[PDB]
Design a binder for this molecule. Structure first.
Ligand code: HEM
Ligand code: HEM
Ligand SMILES: Cc1cc(N)nc(COC[C@H]2C[C@H](OCc3cc(C)cc(N)n3)CN2)c1
Ligand SMILES: Cc1cc(N)nc(COC[C@H]2C[C@H](OCc3cc(C)cc(N)n3)CN2)c1
Ligand SMILES: C[C@H](O)[C@H](O)[C@H]1CNc2nc(N)[nH]c(=O)c2N1
Ligand SMILES: C[C@H](O)[C@H](O)[C@H]1CNc2nc(N)[nH]c(=O)c2N1
Ligand SMILES: [Zn+2]
Lengths: 411, 407
């Protein structure tokens, strides 16, 4: 079957066939759409088909489908599964798998870059100290003094589910949040729970508004251990505005390296529960969400106050006015300091070009409109006007529950 | 089978049971989500009638009464005998209000129970349709104090005698393809304008020409009528701080009035059912004014503001966008024409969702349409999980009549 998508601005029509290769479920049915729902130990049994499907895809990508090398690898993996109940990826397959999980990530607007991903193989890691070292190297490499490079570090896969490698942090670099006795929050409200765990584990909290959290690292199913990222490795940008000189006095800064550390990478049925990956920021992630969500730094009021906007009625669009200024400031600050960032116009335009190319060479590009459309100025970006088809391909990145909810404490 | 929706800003969780009533299909499957796709006999009719009358009698706390049974019997007899049936006035009003209630793409539904229903099932000619429509326009406009209304023409019969309004909205501006190569007026309406010209209309060839109505009675060839200019409330657009803004020569009309949709009630089909509310500011200032395939004025406005249009990263488009939208709201407010901003409307909608969850067990909502086209995440609907599903009575898309009509 063929499925068409239309862009209602350009009338360009694309034809999707790639969706036929999708097997995993969406959450939706013929009677309900779950498109806005954020979230709608394998046996041999289930494992060889998953491995075979992956290796067929890999060997096709290298133009060696059906070759002796392809057949020998299938046999070798099969014997390894029946004998050890799992298998190890070759380095090449690991690299291919990790790039494809990114290529397949339907919520990711930054996918034009998918084939340029530096893969760091950390499958020989055994301890939390080993993990800390790998992560520091990743941070240093990715940061590259402001000229950001995409990277992923891949720790040992799940075995019995009792020996999992996990990074307890949701991102490698994030600011602490502290709930005060009066009910207010100091720092980032998103990270209160994790910050409380760190303190419990023995972290001495500076208790300021932008304290970089320690890493809390779990190797081999052991209790997690605390480590401080060397401050010299943590690149940060003070936020100022090109025309408003009072903007600096808001005391705002942000870190340069967006690095997700709590997702699960699935390749050929294997589960990599610790796979921190990083890119660079689109400006709205910081200027819209991190700064202006009510449940985050929530700076809209203070900024609009300083701008002397009419705050007496929502219909003055004071919030919208302050919003644009904050986002100008984020982009200006990053650019002035020579730290990679992309604006939402540039990034959505690139994604549309990526998507059309993918339709041509690959037969499709799964995309989740709810996430791809930026959180400000939606319809003045080309993605708003683009019909998208959302479906799940493997290799993939998946959500996993926070480890404090599941961990069996050794003590 | 029982489903939860979470608000990620407030942690409030609602439980949806109403989706289990859902009849029609979404376009989605377990394998593929189509959430962002714009458009994915006697024997058939009695089930649909029954389902509807059951919900109606339920709503007036008379479920399983003799009056309920008797009506089911009567409609059953009527379908058996005539191949269709006629709604009671009470049922018509109920169905129309519920079609709005069920409109998953409508952020303005807190208002759903205050809908004025004009029963035009006694209409027979295009001139009668023109009359009904003028009365709707005047009633709804109410000198700027807008009131929601729907006018319901006769239901489909054998489908060769359809009433249709060919216009997509009762009030829209003409679009003219130019020798130049550009477009004058609204490019969205170039084709409909040509059809009007072809059917005889004398176009003034301006930027903001109110289109004539093209009305189809009883499956006949449609006819042209000019809405009395005096019934079309328009608003010149100025800015509370930028004096040059008025020089752009922009205006918009007060009454958003959809006229090309099909109302389905208890299996009966009302192919001409124009309905109207009032505007949310972004519809005009973001979509009508700034879409590239619409009036596309961002460039001109940005220039008048003297912004750095060199780099996308100066966010000049974004800055101009906010100002255009401040001006739209300010202009409607100053002229006392009802308008709602996107903060107000979305806040109202969250309250409505809570009401519907509490009283009805849910509210079908299409997040893709509900979240405004600017400043998404600073409105509360962005952070609200929504389940989308189809309930009847409903408003449905139907194809433009010219691709169908046999002249
Ligand atoms: C290279 C620069 C990149 C940019 C500008 C970018 C942009 C984004 C943005 C804006 C989002 C939505 C983020 C949010 O709203 O929370 C996102 C989501 C995501 N991207 Fe990227 N991306 C980049 C690189 C990467 C890389 C290297 C990977 C993995 C190898 C990746 C995989 C993902 C995934 C899995 C999500 C979904 C996250 C979730 O569900 O919470 N992206 N991307
Ligand atoms: C009273 C003020 C109202 C407001 C502020 C309002 C708001 C909106 C908005 C902003 C949209 C999206 C329009 C677009 O993006 O093109 C919409 C869609 C819609 N509304 Fe309303 N609404 C109102 C009244 C009504 C009424 C009176 C009805 C029917 C009786 C209705 C039924 C619909 C339908 C069916 C759609 C979807 C149209 C489509 O699919 O193209 N609404 N509403
Ligand atoms: C790699 C990368 C680059 C870039 N520019 N930006 C990002 C941001 O991704 C951050 C990730 C972490 C939050 O996760 C929230 C979340 C919650 C839940 C319940 C599920 C889910 N998939 N995601 C939102 N997206 C990642
Ligand atoms: C009643 C009402 C109130 C209000 N404030 N705003 C409106 C605007 O609705 C206008 C209607 C006409 C366009 O039609 C778009 C469209 C196209 C297609 C192909 C399908 C579809 N369902 N809708 C967009 N929605 C309507
Ligand atoms: C309920 C809703 O799905 C939720 O707020 C989503 C909407 N779209 C998003 N889009 C992006 N990029 N990131 C997000 O966190 C969200 N949140
Ligand atoms: C392709 C995509 O579905 C399309 O551009 C939608 C997105 N959301 C929308 N939302 C509203 N309210 N109105 C629209 O016309 C659209 N267009
Ligand atoms: Zn769906």
């Amino acid at each position: 079957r063929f499925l068409k998508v239309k862009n209602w601005e350009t009338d360009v029509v694309l034809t999707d066939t790639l969706h036929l290769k999708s097997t995993l479920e969406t959450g939706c049915t013929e009677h309900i759409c779950m498109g806005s729902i954020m979230l709608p130990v394998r046996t041999k049994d289930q494992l060889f088909p998953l491995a075979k499907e992956f290796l067929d895809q890999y060997y096709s990508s290298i133009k060696r489908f059906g070759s002796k090398a392809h057949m020998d690898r299938l046999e070798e993996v099969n014997k390894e599964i029946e004998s050890t109940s799992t298998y190890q990826l070759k380095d090449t397959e690991l690299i291919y798998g990790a790039k494809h999980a990114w290529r397949n990530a339907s919520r990711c607007v930054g996918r034009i870059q998918w084939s340029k991903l530096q893969v760091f193989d950390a499958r020989d890691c055994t301890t939390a100290h080993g993990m800390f070292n790998y992560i520091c190297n990743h941070v240093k490499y990715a940061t590259n003094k402001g000229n950001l490079r995409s990277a992923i570090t891949i720790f040992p896969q799940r075995t019995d589910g009792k020996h999992d490698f996990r990074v307890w942090n949701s991102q490698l670099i994030r600011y602490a949040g502290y709930k005060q006795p009066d009910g207010s929050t100091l720092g980032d409200p998103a990270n209160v729970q994790f910050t409380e765990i760190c303190i419990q584990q023995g972290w001495k909290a500076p208790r300021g508004r932008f304290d970089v959290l320690p890493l809390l690292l779990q190797a081999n199913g052991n209790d997690p251990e605390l480590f401080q990222i060397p401050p010299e490795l943590v690149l940060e940008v003070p936020i100022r505005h090109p025309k408003f000189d009072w903007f600096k006095d808001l005391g705002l800064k942000w870190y340069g390296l967006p690095a997700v550390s709590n997702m699960l990478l699935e390749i050929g049925g294997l589960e990599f529960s610790a796979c921190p990956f990083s890119g660079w920021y689109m400006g709205t992630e910081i200027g819209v969400r991190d700064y202006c969500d009510n449940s985050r730094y929530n700076i809209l009021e203070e900024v609009a106050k300083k701008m002397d906007l009419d705050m007496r009625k929502t219909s003055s669009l004071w919030k919208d006015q302050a919003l644009v200024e904050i986002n100008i400031a984020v982009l200006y600050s990053f650019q002035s300091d020579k730290v990679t960032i992309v604006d939402h116009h540039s990034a959505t335009e690139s994604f549309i070009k990526h998507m059309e190319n993918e339709y041509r060479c690959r037969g499709g590009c799964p995309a989740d409109w709810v996430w791809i459309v930026p959180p400000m100025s939606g319809s003045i970006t080309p993605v708003f006007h683009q019909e998208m088809l959302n479906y799940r391909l493997t290799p993939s990145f998946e959500y996993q529950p926070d480890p404090w909810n599941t961990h069996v404490w050794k003590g």
